[PDB]
Amino acid sequence: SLAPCGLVPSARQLEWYNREMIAFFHFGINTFEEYVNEGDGKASTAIFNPTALDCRQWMQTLKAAGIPAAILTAKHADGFCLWPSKYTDYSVKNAAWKNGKGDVVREFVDACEEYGLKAGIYLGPHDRHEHLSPLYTTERYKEYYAHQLGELMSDYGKIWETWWDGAGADELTTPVYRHWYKIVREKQPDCVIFGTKNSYPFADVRWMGNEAGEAGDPCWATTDSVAIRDEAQYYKGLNEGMLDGDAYIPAETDVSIRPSWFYHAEEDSRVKSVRELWDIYCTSVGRNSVLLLNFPPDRRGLIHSTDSLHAALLKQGIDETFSTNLLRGAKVKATNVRGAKYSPEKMLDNEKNTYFAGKDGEVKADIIFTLPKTIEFDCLMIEEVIELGHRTTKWSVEYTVDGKNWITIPEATDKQAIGHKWIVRLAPVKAKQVRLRIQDGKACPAIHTFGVYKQSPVF
Prior knowledge:
PDB class: structural genomics, unknown function
Radius of gyration: 23 Å
Pfam families: Alpha_L_fucos (PF01120), F5_F8_type_C (PF00754)
Oligomer: monomer
Distance between the termini: 41 Å
CATH topology of the largest domain: TIM Barrel
InterPro entries: FA58C, Galactose-bd-like_sf, GH, Glyco_hydro_29, Glyco_hydro_29_N
Largest sheet: 7 strands, parallel
Keywords: Glycosidase, Hydrolase, Lipoprotein, Signal
Order of helices and strands: HEHEHEHHEHEEHHEEHEHEEEEEEE
CATH class of the largest domain: Alpha Beta
EC number: 3.2.1.51
Shape: globular
Strand content: 15-25%
């Protein structure tokens, strides 16, 4: 067995990585206001009134889109609660919707269960509504939040992510988040925590410093926990992470399918294109991260058609692209092969658990794939055995036809991270042979997958 190298992921972190994509559902009282993305806590609860709400419809969107998990805004900073909490009146309890007798969180988690999707919860740390009270104190709010957390972590089935937005959360101290973390961890042991700012010691996953859907190149799963803490002053630390980072807290990349996070009819014509989403996919999922994509339900309580369409087409595109590893069938020769159990042919076998590996202490390897017939490709992907750590730290891919010389691939030269998955897109090339150069690392290579592909016409 290979020894792991450096910091390694937890069981939670492995489960989260494997999701690849997660849906965000930004919905609430803001949706019923005119052009509001950040509500003031002053809107009348009465205005919340979806007319054809169907969380099943939301789940059908996700099914078609290949998305295995979903996070609902149970409470945004406006402080309006989507479930009839015992601990406030600023909720659905006092909505026009269902004469105050509804529970959107209920509908949501019921639909997730029905469809076999993992449910998550966004419960806004900064609460503008509570801040309106002359009685507001941090200590008081800590208890309020804890009460609500208890409801959501107890009575609504299995919860697989809790999201703590850092926006406006600067007054919230580490010991406050501790109190909250203990609740999550006790009641929901498989629950992954997206943590920002002063929650840094409790975070399972981090922010990556923009909402544009662009994780860094490289993007390490490790970083210093101070980067989370001092968010605004460590863009690089968040976006790229650090190879020598003191913590294993991988990046989660969040973005809206629209210009805004909440629904506006005027943005129906401004949904990101399939090509845009493919780009994003490649700069998140394809840069050692996970893609959290927001679909905002409308005032009917439905996901818009365009949003749904584009997500569905991205899935088709992804599926077509990676369905055929053009290297399959190759004759493979490598340097630095640990053993038959670990032959380079493993990178090609489509098995979940097998991998190529090198010998202890030898961090370099060269692998040559000789193809029976010349292939045309414009995309490649490589996957590391992440349980074993970030091992490889420099890699390149080359090709030839006349075998007279190895031709470099501009976009796949002296790359750094691999981790969970790294995708490279490239001007189409024809190849009779392909070379994978493992050029440097902290330990001998351990690689699950290597492939080249032809991008779907969908894209």
